[PDB]
Symmetry: C4
Subunit: 65 residues, 4 copies
Amino acid sequence: DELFSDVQDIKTALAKIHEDNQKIISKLESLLLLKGEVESIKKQINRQNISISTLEGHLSSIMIA
Amino acid sequence: DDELFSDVQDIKTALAKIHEDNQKIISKLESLLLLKGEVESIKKQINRQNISISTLEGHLSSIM
Amino acid sequence: DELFSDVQDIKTALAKIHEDNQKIISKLESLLLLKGEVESIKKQINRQNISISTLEGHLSSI
Amino acid sequence: DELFSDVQDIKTALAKIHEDNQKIISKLESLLLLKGEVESIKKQINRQNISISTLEGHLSSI
């Protein structure tokens, strides 16, 4: 009957929500990789700050002639 | 059967709500995924910046 | 009916998935405020780069 | 019945999307760490600005 048509509609919308959940999960995964790169950026800027300090060190030597 | 029909309709309503949740969630993830290109561009500027410090570290010795 | 209790559990489980999705949506909305942060960062960096170069120019004149 | 087994199929598929949600929850939790990575970078760029101003101050003095 119309009950069987309905029961197959529930099954199919459940299968479609499952399939979109896999795509949402991939996009989350790809953002998590981007978190790894943002972590490396954090690390590179700290290394740059260490370097600016060397500059400043030599610049102090120049100022005292 | 009137009760089962009405309950089955509840399940279908509930699925349509979850389908709409999925679509709102997919939309916010696609807006976030724009960060990818911004982070690639930041990687390039950091490298450009590293180079520039070395040009500086050096000049500060030909002077010194 | 075992069938009635089954349909009730099915209803309860869906409403819980839907209630949990609301929390997922607000948290994701809260991450979109990062686009403004990361952009402010891109601008900061370009400005620092410019400055370092502006420093080399001054060094040449010394 | 044909029906009982179909309703079992629905329960199985429902368990799956509950499963999906747990995995979306755990990933999202991990992603939320990004806000703190971005805030840390902002602090680091502030400190860099300061350290550059110092350097220009010194080139100014010379």
